[PDB]
Write a structure and sequence with these properties.
This protein is of the alpha/beta class. Among the domains are: 102 residues, Elongation Factor Tu (Ef-tu), domain 3; 89 residues, Immunoglobulin-like. Helix content is 23%, strand content 27%. It is built from ten helices and 26 strands. An eight-stranded parallel β-barrel has the order 1-2-5-12-13-14-15-16. Strands 6-11-9-10-7-8 form a six-stranded antiparallel beta sheet, with no helix packed on it. A six-stranded antiparallel beta sheet has the order 19-20-21-26-23-24. It is elongated, with a radius of gyration of 24 Å. It starts with 5 loop residues before the first strand and ends with a strand. The structure holds calcium ion (3 copies) and sodium ion. One calcium ion (CA) binds next to loops. InterPro entries: A-amylase_thermo, Alpha-amylase_C_pro, GH, GH13_cat_dom, Glyco_hydro_b.
Amino acid sequence: AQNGTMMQYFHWYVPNDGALWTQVENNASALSDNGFTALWLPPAYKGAGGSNDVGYGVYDMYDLGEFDQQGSVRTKYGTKDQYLSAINTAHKNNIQIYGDVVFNHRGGADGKSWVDTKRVDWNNRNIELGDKWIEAWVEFDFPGRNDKYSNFHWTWYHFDGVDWDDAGEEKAIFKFKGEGKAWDWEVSSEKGNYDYLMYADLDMDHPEVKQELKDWGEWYINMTGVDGFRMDAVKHIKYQYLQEWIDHLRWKTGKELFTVGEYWNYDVNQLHNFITKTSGSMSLFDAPLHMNFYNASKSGGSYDMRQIMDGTLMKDNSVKAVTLVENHDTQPLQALESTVDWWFKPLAYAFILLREEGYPSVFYADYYGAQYSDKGHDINMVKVPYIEELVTLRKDYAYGKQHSYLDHWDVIGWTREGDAKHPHSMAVIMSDGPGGSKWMYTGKPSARYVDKLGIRTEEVWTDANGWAEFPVNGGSVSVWVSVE
Ligand SMILES: [Ca+2]
Ligand SMILES: [Ca+2]
Ligand SMILES: [Ca+2]
Ligand code: NA
């Protein structure tokens, strides 16, 4: 019935105070009222960085902040009990939970082992540079967990490679040798073969790894009650195994288990290839759309708004698109920083929230604002104007057939006819440059429209044929709504 709306409920620089799960539980009610129906939460298990780990330095995925490992019992975000209680409170408020799943690598090993390896080139991992015996951090036993839930132990042959030799003290990519040992395929062919990223790289061709990740996945579903998954770093993970894994869990549990992968590349054709090679078993974040928004926001009005959707999953395959404006990899001070200019974000959010295409995601730092410091640089991410109102507008009014007018280089818009449970009409209009107006068809005859954002104060009426001329301020967005 209701439009689905997800939120990335974290960012990179959340404080290390063990409070995020408590904050989920305390805000679930308010978030549901706004219109959020699902939260993507950060990796909930213990990382190599201890409580400082954002979660991607994954060490023990069976330790949800329950065991004394890597310097604390809790994770960055709280304890295991707080996690389960937050998920339960989300469910009572009609909010689903997508858990972040980090399968590419493991870090923070309990011990090192001598491994016979081939050094490979950083920029082409198929170029071999010489054999070397190394000491690799690849023994994972989780002694603080004492075999609760699982006695599985990771050793060298579960991994394809590392980037650190502890004996010779050399940083280089060392590919493990052995019968059947190779970089996995298919993965991104960037850098020749992009299987290797960081820490100890999982060998997705090893039978014991393939089974262990399935075992953990069923345990995690039954332990936590999560409703689906956000898959980390999928361009570095054997595509066929990712499909194998989610296919298995959907079959074993009978649950829908909505899944979205992070394939972070701005050429949509690499994302299309991933979706083809995984048989459409998961959505992907619309990374190319973020870069369209970034470019438009830095263009001073000169961006061709007719093309704001071009080369995106939102356009090419919208039922596999999780749309977004910003995330923890693009926010300020991160390696892949490309932060959308603040002035444009109300437009970008109105675009992903009020268009019929795709499954929109709101960024925590955009919804709440965020202040932080790193490397001596102080960052102030200001809450996006109208962000709560736009989420409400999606919840209550953006329904029914859509008529699109991406037909001018500044002024674009679209209309939504409404449906039976939501019998209101809407016309969205925005401009990245000077203001203007556009004739658009809503299909609602002789009806009164007002700007639910309160920027334009006049009334707009359709004629007897459902057509009206809607106005918009420069560098702005208006959301015209004719309630029933
Ligand atoms: Ca392999
Ligand atoms: Ca990999
Ligand atoms: Ca323009
Ligand atoms: Na691998």
